[PDB]
Design a protein around this ligand. Structure first.
Ligand SMILES: [Mg+2]
Ligand SMILES: [Mg+2]
Ligand SMILES: [Mg+2]
Ligand SMILES: [Mg+2]
Ligand SMILES: [Mg+2]
Ligand SMILES: [Mg+2]
Ligand SMILES: [Mg+2]
Ligand SMILES: [Mg+2]
Ligand SMILES: [Mg+2]
Ligand SMILES: [Mg+2]
Ligand SMILES: [Mg+2]
Ligand SMILES: [Mg+2]
Ligand SMILES: [Mg+2]
Ligand SMILES: [Mg+2]
Ligand SMILES: [Mg+2]
Ligand SMILES: [Mg+2]
Ligand SMILES: [Mg+2]
Lengths: 123, 80, 82, 150, 129, 205
RNA sequence: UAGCUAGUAGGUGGGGUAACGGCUCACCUAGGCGACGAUCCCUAGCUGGUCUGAGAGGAUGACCAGCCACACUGGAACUGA
RNA sequence: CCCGCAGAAGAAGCACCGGCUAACUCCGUGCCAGCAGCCGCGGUAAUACGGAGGGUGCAAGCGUUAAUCGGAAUUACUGGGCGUAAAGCGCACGCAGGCGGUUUGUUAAGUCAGAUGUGAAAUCCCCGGGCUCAACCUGGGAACUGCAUCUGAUACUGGCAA
């Protein structure tokens, strides 16, 4: 309030807790697949979502989401992950770059293939 | 004189080791209010002569010591 | 000793020099004392192409500056009075 | 120079023994392009009835505004409920920059070259309204001398 | 506490005005007067009046034009807690130009129109329109 | 970079003739224009202010055949310059060479007038300028290269060029096939059916 | 993190440096700093400027130019303008 | 950079189309497979999943992720709040600190004025000039809102006096 008051103790701007410690602001981070779970979503929804807990290059162990329809990923697969939560799966805050490292692309995808990492099918 | 400084005494109690207070007002660079930014200076005064409470005029000389780059010029007032 | 020389503020394949007085020991495009002309060698025959405050160059050569080789030419190529 | 535009249309529910009974609301602005603007609310169980009933309300409830050319004399502040709004002469660059919603009143009302901004809640019913009152309080660029003179 | 009297002037006015009060009075001072001047000379008040000697009394006659009060607003700007000073080029203009700002200078309390012409500046006491 | 796609489709969505088949026939039809720009074109596009704002600039763009990037920079340059940002925008657009080649008649549509530019079949104040966006200035003098003169296209080009309302700001031969950008077109020349302030607004927020 | 400080603060003289100087020494005075934040801890090369913002700000210090600093790590001096 | 030669010949992709937000239908699926920036879509007619036709948007790029500021007046100096929504210390006394009625004189520190110097060049910006345009390059201005020195002005604030 008071001017004195601002003088003693300046206005301070809260700092921004990130939502995705892909450590140090990194576009993505490599990791090794600890577990390949599949768990089920929150309240309204109901499904068998695929995920994987992943040891990261920088030591973080993070649970990441696997996108697409069907995937070949087991324990010891080396993957790449990006930011991107999944509200449904509380706790999951990262996605797996399909068609990166050992991660395959989604079989047969025709629409939006670059997400899901799928080559331009030999038209 | 190439500039001079005024200021009250603050401490006389030391074989010429005179230190003087200087008082400016300045606009707070952020909230515009004016505050008191004080400066203390370690000034020389041969044969000790000023006393705590004296206003005094002062000038910038070369180093008389690691601390001292100012001698005094005149005195002004006493028995505060 | 101070010197008059060409800094090359050109641009790949189309050089355009500043002419500067500076401590000869510094970099060809580094700290200098004052600028004293310019020299576009692609001037084109149109108009300008070698403006050059002589009465300063003068001053420094008075104060002991050496001149480049190229610059020396330019001065004796500006002619001098006309 | 009839000139009119509706700003926001909305649904609202009433709730009775038998369920929700819904209905709509319309917020409109009309002006001549030369001062004079009004807004109208008016609600109704169907949309076209609501906007119609509104355009009407706006025809009356019309105030006028001591413009100064295509612009405003002095920069004015307005405020009603949660909407606290501000607009400025702007020696027209082009001008007419505001949040579509008070661009609406400006536009029709004949102002041609302001810059504006709304603070607080963007709730139209109160911003278009804080603005009208805004332009209204705004006093005459010489009938300030009328004021003084003596 | 009495601490800021100039706001009190500006205020006793603002208030009484809004109370469609004919006159209004208060403890006076060199300063109150210099402004009561500019206020009159700019035509925001009818005329002042200082009626005392040991305990002087500034008195202002208010004005009402249409039905309104003439002084549509009157704010402090500098104040003990926070002094304002503007150089000449940085002087403020109220309501785009209409209405005025009272600026005290090394050559006396005068408006912004005034000080701006005088080519100087000082402490911007208050805003009026 | 060039649009390249079936070009009437555009006029149809944009609802108006952008003169992109310019050539022979006029007042379209022999096309379909209007009531089905797609498979649901039939439908009423009751559309947001954003949309009407969007489609206006789109219209202007499909016209001079300018892609987003360049158009943006046009807008930006327009705005930099004093004068009505929206007018200035329209000015720059016209200042385009390719445009001031179709406008002098040497080319059927701006698309064609352009192929000419890129194919080094033009010369400003003497010299050959093969870049479609070469801004043209008052008193300039755009001719056709002697090599390939009165060749096919360029005839019928200078032909129906007179069918058109026909400029004012530019005087132009037809035998030599030279012509002089006399002045920067004013607001009042060209237009009517184009709404700057909208595409000033689209780029204002 | 609320106290910090013995070459510590000042004086006198000897010595020293290209040069003023607790720079160093000997001896004397008992000072010097500190809530206008010392001391302690954490982080950090500074600038011009760069990005953003209507501004005020916020963020930032690659590429260009200026200054500083470092040259396997710690320490030293020799040569030399 | 210029001239000739051949033949449209070698040269289009990516995201999106439930609302925000420009762009809609069919088939498959059936709280599954799955989508998802936010709201939230999926249990038999899904414009929201996947495919297809069509469309919208950008184009040698297009999407996704990461990152700064913006919108956020959401740390509010400009520019915010604390009866009931986040927020008046359970109450008091008071040091430092902040602020302080009214008069005259004095001072000239705060404040104001002018002059001088300085504020590197590049950058930014205005007007031009040169590369076929542009990016790019360059002339010249403008600007660097700052700092200091000197001399002045004394209404306000600070100091001294009564
Ligand atoms: Mg491109
Ligand atoms: Mg000694
Ligand atoms: Mg802002
Ligand atoms: Mg390098
Ligand atoms: Mg070493
Ligand atoms: Mg040696
Ligand atoms: Mg839509
Ligand atoms: Mg999708
Ligand atoms: Mg179906
Ligand atoms: Mg903010
Ligand atoms: Mg609040
Ligand atoms: Mg509460
Ligand atoms: Mg209480
Ligand atoms: Mg007083
Ligand atoms: Mg500079
Ligand atoms: Mg040019
Ligand atoms: Mg006084």
């Amino acid at each position: 309030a008071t001017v004195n008051q601002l003088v003693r103790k300046p206005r301070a701007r809260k700092v921004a807790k990130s939502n995705v410690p892909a450590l140090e602001a990194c576009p993505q981070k490599r990791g090794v697949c600890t577990r390949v779970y599949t768990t089920t979503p929150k309240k309204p929804n109901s499904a068998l979502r695929k995920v994987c807990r992943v040891r990261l290059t920088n030591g973080f162990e993070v649970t990441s989401y696997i996108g697409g329809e069907g995937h070949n990923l087991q324990e010891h697969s080396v993957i790449l992950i990006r930011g991107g939560r999944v509200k449904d799966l509380p706790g999951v805050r990262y996605h797996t770059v399909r068609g990166a490292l050992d991660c395959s692309g989604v079989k047969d995808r025709k629409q939006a293939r670059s997400k899901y990492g799928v080559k331009r099918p030999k038209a | 004189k190439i500039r001079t400084l005024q200021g009250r005494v603050v401490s006389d109690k030391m074989e010429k080791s005179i230190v003087v207070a200087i008082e400016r007002f300045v606009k707070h660079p952020i909230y515009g209010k004016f505050i008191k930014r004080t400066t203390k200076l370690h000034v020389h005064d041969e044969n000790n002569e000023c006393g705590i409470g004296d206003v005094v005029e002062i000038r910038e000389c070369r180093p008389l010591s690691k601390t001292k780059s100012w001698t005094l010029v005149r005195v002004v007032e006493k028995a505060v | 000793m101070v010197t008059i020389r060409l800094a090359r503020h050109g641009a790949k394949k189309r050089p355009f020099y500043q002419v500067v007085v500076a401590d000869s020991r510094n970099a060809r495009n580094g700290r200098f004392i004052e600028r004293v002309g310019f020299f576009n060698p692609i001037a084109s025959e149109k108009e300008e192409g070698t403006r050059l405050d002589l009465d300063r160059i003068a001053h420094w050569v008075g104060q002991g500056a050496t001149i480049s080789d190229r610059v020396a030419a330019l001065i004796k190529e500006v002619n001098k009075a006309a | 120079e009839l000139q009119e535009k509706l700003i926001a249309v909305n649904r609202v529910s009433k709730t009775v023994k038998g369920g929700r009974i819904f209905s709509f609301t319309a917020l409109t602005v009309v002006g001549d392009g030369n001062g004079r603007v009004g807004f109208g609310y008016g609600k109704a169980r169907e949309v076209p009835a609501a906007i119609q009933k509104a355009m009407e309300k706006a025809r009356r409830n019309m105030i006028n505004v001591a413009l100064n050319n295509g612009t405003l004399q002095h920069p004015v502040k307005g405020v009603h409920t949660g909407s606290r709004v501000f607009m400025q002469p702007a020696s027209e660059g082009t001008g007419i920059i505001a949040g579509g919603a008070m661009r609406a009143v400006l536009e029709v009302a004949g102002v041609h070259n302001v810059l504006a901004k709304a603070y607080g809640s963007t709730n139209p019913i109160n911003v278009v309204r804080a603005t009208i009152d805004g332009l209204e309080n705004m006093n005459s660029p010489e009938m300030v001398a009328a004021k003084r003179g003596k | 506490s009495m601490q800021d009297p100039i706001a009190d002037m500006l205020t006793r006015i603002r208030n009484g005005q809004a109370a469609n009060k004919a006159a209004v009075t208060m403890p006076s001072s060199k300063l109150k007067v210099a402004i009561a001047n500019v206020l009159k000379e700019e035509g925001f008040i009818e005329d002042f009046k200082v009626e005392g000697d040991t305990k002087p009394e500034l008195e202002l006659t208010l004005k009402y034009f249409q039905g309104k009060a003439v002084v549509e607003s009157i704010q402090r700007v500098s104040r003990p807690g926070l002094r304002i000073y503007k150089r000449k080029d940085e002087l403020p203009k109220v309501m785009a130009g209409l209405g005025i700002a009272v600026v005290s200078t090394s050559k006396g309390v005068m408006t912004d129109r005034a000080a701006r012409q005088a080519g100087l500046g000082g402490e911007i006491i208050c805003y009026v329109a | 970079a060039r649009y390249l796609g079936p070009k009437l489709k555009l006029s149809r969505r944009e609802g108006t003739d952008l003169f992109l088949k310019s050539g022979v026939r006029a007042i379209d039809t022999k096309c379909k224009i209007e009531q089905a720009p797609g498979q649901h074109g039939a439908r009423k596009p009751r559309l947001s202010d954003y949309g009407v704002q969007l489609r206006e600039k789109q219209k202007v763009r499909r016209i001079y055949g300018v892609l987003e990037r360049q158009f943006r920079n046009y807008y930006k340059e327009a705005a930099r310059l004093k004068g009505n940002t929206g007018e200035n925008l329209l000015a720059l657009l016209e200042g385009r060479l390719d445009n001031v080649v179709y406008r002098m008649g040497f080319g059927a549509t701006r698309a064609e007038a352009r192929q000419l530019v890129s194919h080094k079949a033009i010369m400003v104040n003497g010299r050959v300028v093969n870049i479609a966006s070469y801004q043209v200035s008052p008193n300039d003098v755009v001719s056709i290269r002697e090599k390939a003169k009165k060749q096919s296209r360029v005839k019928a080009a200078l032909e129906l060029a007179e069918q058109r309302e026909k400029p004012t700001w530019l005087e132009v031969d037809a035998g030599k096939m030279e012509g002089t950008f006399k002045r920067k077109p004013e607001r009042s020349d060209l237009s009517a059916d184009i709404n700057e302030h909208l595409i000033v607004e689209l780029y204002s927020k």
